[PDB]
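User: My notes are a mess, but here's the protein and mercury (II) ion's SMILES. Can you give me a structure?
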Amino acid sequence: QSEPELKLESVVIVSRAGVRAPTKATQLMQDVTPDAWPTWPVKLGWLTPRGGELIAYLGHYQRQRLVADGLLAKKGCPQSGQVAIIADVDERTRKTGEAFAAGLAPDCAITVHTQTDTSSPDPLFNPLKTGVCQLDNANVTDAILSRAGGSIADFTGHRQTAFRELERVLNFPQSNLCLKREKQDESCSLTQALPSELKVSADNVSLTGAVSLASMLTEIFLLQQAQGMPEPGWGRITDSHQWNTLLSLHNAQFYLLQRTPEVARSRATPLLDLIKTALTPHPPQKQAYGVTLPTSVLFIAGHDTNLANLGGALELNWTLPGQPDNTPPGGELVFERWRRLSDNSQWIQVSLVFQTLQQMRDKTPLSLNTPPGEVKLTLAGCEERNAQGMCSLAGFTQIVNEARIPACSL
Ligand SMILES: O=P(O)(O)O[C@H]1[C@H](OP(=O)(O)O)[C@@H](OP(=O)(O)O)[C@H](OP(=O)(O)O)[C@@H](OP(=O)(O)O)[C@H]1OP(=O)(O)O
Ligand SMILES: [Hg+2]
Ligand SMILES: [Hg+2]
Ligand SMILES: [Hg+2]
Ligand SMILES: [Hg+2]
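Assistant: No problem, the inputs look usable. Here's the predicted complex:
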């Protein structure tokens, strides 16, 4: 029987945290809808038990997958250090790492390593926020406006259909923001009522107004749906086209602020360094987070901006059939090193593993038989590929080295 010509030797997963309750409950969020936002079972920004179950399913799926590729043994707990887990200091990322280990190796006790100071942000997940490095204000401003077509107005203008869909779901017309508006000479509009301005500083970039509000609100509706709440969007979201139209507002903001290279490259540099060393064969040694690398599997519990920053820095673009959110909760950017048996050459494969919005909704258990969705990625900048379309280690290493910003390494 035909034999595999490539042997899996290393896997690095960068996962976004799973389903959580919204991070905030502002007055603005209430003013754009006359209806009352549904309450969540956990504190704001915390992982919901259902969210952990969905992550555990992915962990259960990955265990079957890696076993099939012979990287992990089908029985028992993995050898010490065989599986390493690192998470951002947040409650939701720590819990995502735990839910993943739980699903991957039940009752096996796999440490979830984090930065030691938990009351402080971890620069691995954003070197801009902690001041490791700074953004070039003028250059970032030009790059974002450039990707916006010259102006934020023209940008939102091309997405009015999506903004009106959101208004419809909110019953924006009967919101206090609308009824208490002084220029009632014109129809009430989110984009009109909340002008979006681009804010850029050394440590951050943002969009004020309807752009950021809509990105947050549409993500909240996806969260309600994934959380299994009765009627997400107060029952006003009734079909797939609406889900896509709504979430496009979310993907639109990430395209501008997280994928733009002038931002992404600096923001994803620490992760690029970690991913590269973890995938590069070399003498194992205890290091960051007390983790020993290289090893067989490395699971990194991060955030959606991390996935988007990595996509922009590596020029990895994707769309996920069945999942309106390009960087969905639990979504995994999977990096794998395969060794070609023929000449023992090294190769890197990249894919985006995710659960469809329905798989989240029905909380469906995953397995090789009922697997999550997966999109194989192509490194836009790679030249040397193998028969399977993977990039050589050398090629991959070159792309990472050209994409990272030295000033932003840890
Ligand atoms: O870590 P935080 O300080 O709590 O910031 C969070 C986090 O963003 P980051 O990727 O930069 O960490 C969320 O991403 P996830 O952890 O859920 O993957 C994001 O959620 P969404 O962009 O998907 O909505 C949310 O944004 P939001 O304000 O809309 O809740 C945002 O909050 P901040 O805007 O306050 O930073
Ligand atoms: Hg540790
Ligand atoms: Hg190392
Ligand atoms: Hg996202
Ligand atoms: Hg998201």
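The chain has 15 helices and twelve strands.
User: Great, I'll file this with my notes.
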